[PDB]
């Protein structure tokens, strides 16, 4: 598709009306209409009005009388706001009525009326010789042949040319015109040549490659800057046109070479003409910034003036030394020849040269316009690096980047009110177990739990996490934008938690509109409010699970036993206004009214009872463990005695403490208390504090004691740290292949030229990196990129430093972002619970692996996209056996990583387990490679097969992850599981198919029958803290509730030989 197909035409001639049409050309009878007769726009930002007449009127000189019309006075009358369409239409209409162009209507169909000379003569009020010639003989304006229209008047006047002023396009500006267009009497090509050659000896003149009305016309500039801005706009036009032509589309090019040909100009114009005629690749790639076009054009010229390509440089130089010559590619020239063959006497510019376009392979990425780029850096590339120098990142203002401490949660309102259960497992509590658990509980309470865990608990507050969601409900209710919801709905409870004023539905599912002028104050919530609310919802769901309404039943009561102001009692009182007779009271030692101020145990005289109790008692004072123990025992006892459904808090949920609770409940006469541990989503994500749930039932409870409960493990496994908590640093100096970085994030700015290099260097650490420039003019490019431990574990396996730097240099300068808006990164980004559990399991397995001695290799079967790479040490060889893994032989060879790329056979004969090897089977055992779930008996079968297969080799360690059965019992009873599910009895993590679960006892019994050594470990609190500290991940609430029961029920079998 080489040859251009374009239909050339003199568009400016086609615009000139037939003489018969001039009388009604203003359409005197009817109002001018927008979008047809005019275009008005008010740019409120620049506060500039802009009118633009359409049709023949787009070229209209205005007489000073026309300027005196009120229409042109309008923008002054409305300095700040748009001219109303009424006034604009009426003024433009009456002014339009005022205009009248001298003309003689005729019968011959061949005539056209010379609109230019007509309106021009009118504007000068018929004073100039053309104006006189016209007012005396209007019939002179009619023309058959377009050129003779002017020859008639040059002959009539005897003048060699007419200097005709240009109209401004907007009719509101009255600015003095940058140039004017002279029109020469040059009937033949020879006259055109002589005039051009004379023009090439006179200041500030230029011209088009061809002329409308087939009559020569030159532009004459008042100043050099005007010549520059004109040349710029024309170059842009010819580049857009040539771009459209090269795509091969048919196009109505009014003239084949749109750009101007300087005849006499300053140097800078000659540079514009030169790069302009190059049709440089940079325009198609949008490498230039068009907002400041001529500047960019001047800049482009300079590079072409000293271009690395000899061809382009000699070509540009040549064009610069012969500026008067028009340069064109051959594909243009054929269009010129076609245009000549159609109309033999057409005039076009005599002095021309046909250069061959020089190909250039540099395919720049680019995109002007808003949007930061979110890079995904490759581990490796074609480029080799040798000892790249450290790259400092600049200081950045808060106007560009800010770093908030924690990412606020995004979540549906219902998800906040969920909770998880953990039922008792042990059938008995033997005394030796009591002494052991007491020793662990006392040793643990005596020295406070991990300082890092307490840091995350004290930074990831639930109040701040839920504030952006809660206030959003306030702002919507405040506008009246909120509407339908059920009476008992959780969205209703959130609405109660947003605003201090009582709300009331006008009828079913319709909240009352606010009284006029009223803007109720948002409800005041302390950190524990929403948690108390979710405990209320929890007690409601526990009383019966099917319910959707959460209103209290009529004639019932609830007590929020720990209290200060306790906003929750007020919100709840407000929630139940439509329900008759519902006692609701806080009852703390620090209680303010409405709540009664009272100590627990209750004074013997005082009578207290309720259908529900929600204790949140917690001693602020430091105290002995025996005192805290007796206090919590008296608290749970008094809470259980006083209600049919207690929901006690436990600040120190050791196994010994909870078992002491169940034993003490056992000691009370005549009531068998069913019980369960619990954790709501509105708790602070990291708090180990756990809500025990007591309730009488007629039967004695089988398996009443706890052991290895998840909620308890969350607390007990945390212990005083051997290291200070890892504070997230903000790095600036990017060393080339260093591996000295503490977890945190790179953040800063570089020159746009250095930017491809800097991205290529930080791919060593960061797995991805957002970048952007603030504006087209500012040359600094901001970059943010958090450090991925997994990418460090990948890139530092060998000393080679490959990167896609060649690809990154396609970005400079427009290809890597723009964003005027301030951006706000968080030190702790959100991540889904499955991903977090995966990272915790990786921390557990990695710390476990570093202890192991003398093993040649790690083999992660089912490794996907090297997901387990964080686990393996930089030394020992890594292997993957996921069929779905993509191959990268350069990356594999460079990074010491074999990839089997075939399904792994679990059958013992097929098995080929090496000596001195660590076999990871993380989460792969539960699925077939095609993604369909494998039945649990088949899972147990393949585990048994891996066991017997590794039974023979002397040194090996398998890690078979799987899902324990008990979790399905718990999620059947829980609520807060936006991710995890229980479809038809199978776990359904993420988007994965539901998959049947193993029971831990049968698996352990099988491994004991095999005779192999094993140890069913699961990751604990310190592992969680390591994953969060390293990856820069805050937990989030729903994940905070679900994570313990989820983590406990993904056991990791650790076969060892």
């Amino acid at each position: 598709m080489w040859h251009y197909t374009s239909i050339n035409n003199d568009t400016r001639v086609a615009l000139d009306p037939k003489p018969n049409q001039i009388r009604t050309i203003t359409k005197p009878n009817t109002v001018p209409q927008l979008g047809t007769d005019y275009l008005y726009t008010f740019n409120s930002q620049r506060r500039s009005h802009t009118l633009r007449l359409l049709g023949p009127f787009q070229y209209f000189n205005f007489s000073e009388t026309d300027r005196g019309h009120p229409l042109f006075r309008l923008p002054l009358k409305y300095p700040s706001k748009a001219i109303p369409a009424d006034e604009l239409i009426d003024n433009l209409h009456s002014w339009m009525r005022s205009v009248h162009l001298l003309h003689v209507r005729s019968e011959d169909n061949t005539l056209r009326y010379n609109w230019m000379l007509g309106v021009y003569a009118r504007s000068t009020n018929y004073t100039t010789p053309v104006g006189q010639l016209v007012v005396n003989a209007p019939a002179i304006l009619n023309y058959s042949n377009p050129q003779d229209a002017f020859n008639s008047v040059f002959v009539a006047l005897g003048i060699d040319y007419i200097d005709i002023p240009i109209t401004n396009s907007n009719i509101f500006d009255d600015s003095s015109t940058p140039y004017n267009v002279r029109i020469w009497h040059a009937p033949t090509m020879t006259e055109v040549n002589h005039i051009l050659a004379l023009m090439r000896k006179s200041t500030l003149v230029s011209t088009h490659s061809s002329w409308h009305w087939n009559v020569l016309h030159t532009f004459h500039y008042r100043s050099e800057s005007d010549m520059i801005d004109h040349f710029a706009a024309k170059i842009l036009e010819d580049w857009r046109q040539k771009e459209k032509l090269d795509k091969g589309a048919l196009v109505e090019a009014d003239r084949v070479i749109q750009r101007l040909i300087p005849l006499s100009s300053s140097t800078y114009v000659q540079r514009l003409a030169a790069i302009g005629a190059l049709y440089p690749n940079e325009f198609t790639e949008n490498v230039l910034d068009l907002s400041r076009l001529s500047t960019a054009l001047l800049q482009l010229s300079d590079t072409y003036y000293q271009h690395a390509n000899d061809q382009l440089r000699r070509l540009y130089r040549r064009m610069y030394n012969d500026s008067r010559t028009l340069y064109m590619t051959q594909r243009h020239q054929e269009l010129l020849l076609a245009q000549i063959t159609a109309d033999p006497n057409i005039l076009l510019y005599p002095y021309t040269y046909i250069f061959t376009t020089i190909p250039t392979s540099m395919n720049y990425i680019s995109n002007t316009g808003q949007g930061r780029i979110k890079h995904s850096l490759t581990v490796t590339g074609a480029t080799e690096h040798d000892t790249v120098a450290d790259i400092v990142l600049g200081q950045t203002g808060e106007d560009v980047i800010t770093i908030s401490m924690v990412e606020p949660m995004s979540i549906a309102v219902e998800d906040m009110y969920g909770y998880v259960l953990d039922t008792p497992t042990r059938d008995i509590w033997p005394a030796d177990e009591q002494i052991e658990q007491k020793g662990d509980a006392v040793a643990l309470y005596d020295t406070k739990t991990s300082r890092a865990l307490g840091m995350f608990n004290n930074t990831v507050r639930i109040d701040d996490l839920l504030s952006p969601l809660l206030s959003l409900v306030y702002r919507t209710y405040i506008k009246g934008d909120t509407m339908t919801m059920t009476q008992g709905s959780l969205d209703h409870l959130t609405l109660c938690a947003a605003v201090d004023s009582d709300i009331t539905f006008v009828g079913n599912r319709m909240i009352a509109p606010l009284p006029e002028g009223y803007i109720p104050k948002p409800m005041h919530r302390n950190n524990s409010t929403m948690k108390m609310l979710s405990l209320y919802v929890a007690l409601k769901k526990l009383e019966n699970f099917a319910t959707n309404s959460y209103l209290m039943a009529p004639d019932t009561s609830i007590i929020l036993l720990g209290a200060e102001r306790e906003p929750a009692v007020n919100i709840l009182r407000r929630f139940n206004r439509n329900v008759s007779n519902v006692r609701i009271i806080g009852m703390g030692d620090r209680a303010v009214e409405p709540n009664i101020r009272v100590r627990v145990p209750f004074p013997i005289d005082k009578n207290i009872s309720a259908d529900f109790i929600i204790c949140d008692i917690n001693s602020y004072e430091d105290q002995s463990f025996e005192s805290m123990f007796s206090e919590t025992i008296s608290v749970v006892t008094t809470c259980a005695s006083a209600a049919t459904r207690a929901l006690v808090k436990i600040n120190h949920p050791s196994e010994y403490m909870i078992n002491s609770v169940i034993e003490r409940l056992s000691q009370l006469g005549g009531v068998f208390y069913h019980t369960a541990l619990l954790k709501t989503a509105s708790q602070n994500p990291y708090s180990y504090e756990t809500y025990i749930y007591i309730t009488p039932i007629a039967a004695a409870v089988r398996f009443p004691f706890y052991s290895n409960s998840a909620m308890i493990n969350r607390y007990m496994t945390a212990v005083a740290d051997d290291e200070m908590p890892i504070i997230p640093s903000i790095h600036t100096v990017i060393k080339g292949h260093s591996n000295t970085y503490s977890p945190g994030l790179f953040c800063g700015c570089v020159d746009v030229q250095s930017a491809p290099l800097a991205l290529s260097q930080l791919k060593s650490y960061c797995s991805e990196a957002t970048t952007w420039r603030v504006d087209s003019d500012d040359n600094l490019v901001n970059i943010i990129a958090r450090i991925d431990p997994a990418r460090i574990a990948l890139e530092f396996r060998t000393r080679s430093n490959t990167s896609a730097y060649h690809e990154y240099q396609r970005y400079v300068p427009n290809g890597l972002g723009f964003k005027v808006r301030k951006t706000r990164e968080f030190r702790y980004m959100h991540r889904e619970v499955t991903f977090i559990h995966k990272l915790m399991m990786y921390a557990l397995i990695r710390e476990q692996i570093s202890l192991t001695e003398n093993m040649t290799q790690v083999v992660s079967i089912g490794g996907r996209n090297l997901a387990d790479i964080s686990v393996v040490p930089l030394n020992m060889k890594y292997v993957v056996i996921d069929p779905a893994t993509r191959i990268e032989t350069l990356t594999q060879e460079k990074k010491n990583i074999e990839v089997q790329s075939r399904p792994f056979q679990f059958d013992a004969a097929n098995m080929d387990l090496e000596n001195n090897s660590i076999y990871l089977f993380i989460a792969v055992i539960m699925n077939e490679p095609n993604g369909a779930a494998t039945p649990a008996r088949m899972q147990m079968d393949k585990i048994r097969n891996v066991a017997t297969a590794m039974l023979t080799r002397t040194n090996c360690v398998a890690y078979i992850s799987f899902y324990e059965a008990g979790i399905i019992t718990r999620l059947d009873q829980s609520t807060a599981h936006k991710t995890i599910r229980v479809e038809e009895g199978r776990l359904k993590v993420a988007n994965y198919v539901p998959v049947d679960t193993l029971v831990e006892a049968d698996v352990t019994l099988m491994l004991r029958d095999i005779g192999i050594t094993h140890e069913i470990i699961r990751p604990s609190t310190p592992e969680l803290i390591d994953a969060c500290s390293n990856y820069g991940i805050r937990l989030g609430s729903t994940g905070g509730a679900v994570l313990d029961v989820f983590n406990h029920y993904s056991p990791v079998i650790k076969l060892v030989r």
Binding site: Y126, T127, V135, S176, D226, I228, L298
Partner: protein
């Protein structure tokens, strides 16, 4: 004061860039004529729109010239000396043949309409009495009448005197382009390699017997206390068409003097031109 603050924050002056964009100083400084030959321009006359200063832009539009840029054709045919590569002069007003309304007058009419609005708004802001306000308006419309009445003579007679004077031998430079935004006189000097250059235009400050101080007040006598041969037509003064010979013979005399005035200097400097010299060492690369 508000629009002024917004305006002068952009800058009291500007300079055109090599790319042709304007670049305003950002500074509020009083102008001096020392800046006339500088890169700097007064910022009032940039005619560049500003977001909040529209009244100032529009008021400065009143200062835009109503004339036209005639080319010096008769002065070319005579081969009269001209510093410009295409000689040209801005003639302040067009001839207005045959018109009922003078365009030059009608412009001034719109001008006083604008100024009327401005002076009136400033009047209601100062809460001044109606009578004085109407007196201002009356004096304005009176001016517009005097201006029409004079306008016929300024356009139909004075213009051919500017046009004829544009062709005179010694009027060798371009005076204007019509663009206040961008017109800067071309600045030649007589540079020499062995000395400092002499600018041809300089703020030498010599008043040349008061030639270079410009009283604007002079427009008042013109509008009000002066008569013209054309305005008088009800006596009909015949127009004067002065002989060429008086100015030509003068211009020639000057050209004759200053032509030969440099001659002895020219001859000697022509001889000595090769004589300027630099000290140079010649190291020898090879024996003998």
């Amino acid at each position: 004061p508000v629009e002024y603050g917004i305006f002068v924050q952009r800058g009291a002056t500007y300079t055109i860039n090599a790319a042709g964009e304007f670049e305003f100083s950002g500074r509020n400084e009083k102008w001096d004529q020392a800046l006339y030959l500088s890169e700097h321009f007064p910022a009032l006359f940039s005619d560049v729109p500003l977001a909040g200063a529209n009244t100032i832009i529009a008021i400065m539009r009143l200062f835009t010239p109503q004339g036209f840029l005639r080319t010096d054709d008769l002065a070319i045919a005579a081969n009269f000396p001209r510093a410009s590569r295409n000689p040209q002069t801005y003639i302040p007003y067009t001839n207005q043949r045959g018109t009922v309304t003078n365009e030059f007058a009608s412009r001034f009419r719109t001008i006083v309409a604008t100024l009327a609005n401005v002076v009136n708004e400033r009047a209601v802001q100062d809460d001044m009495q109606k009578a004085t306000r109407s007196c201002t308006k009356q004096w304005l419309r009176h001016l517009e009448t005097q201006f029409d009445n004079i306008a016929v003579a300024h356009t139909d007679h004075l213009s051919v005197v500017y046009a004829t004077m544009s062709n005179f031998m010694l009027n060798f430079t371009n005076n204007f382009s019509g663009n206040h935004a961008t017109f800067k006189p071309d600045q030649y000097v007589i540079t020499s390699p062995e000395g400092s250059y002499k600018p041809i235009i300089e703020r030498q400050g010599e008043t040349v017997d008061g030639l270079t101080i410009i009283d604007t007040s002079i427009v008042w006598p013109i509008l009000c206390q002066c008569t013209y041969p054309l305005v008088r037509q009800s006596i009909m003064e015949e127009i004067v068409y002065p002989d060429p010979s008086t100015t030509l013979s003068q211009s020639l005399s000057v050209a004759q003097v200053l032509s030969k005035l440099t001659l002895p200097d020219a001859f000697i400097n022509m001889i000595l031109s090769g004589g300027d010299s630099v000290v140079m060492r010649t190291y020898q690369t090879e024996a003998d």
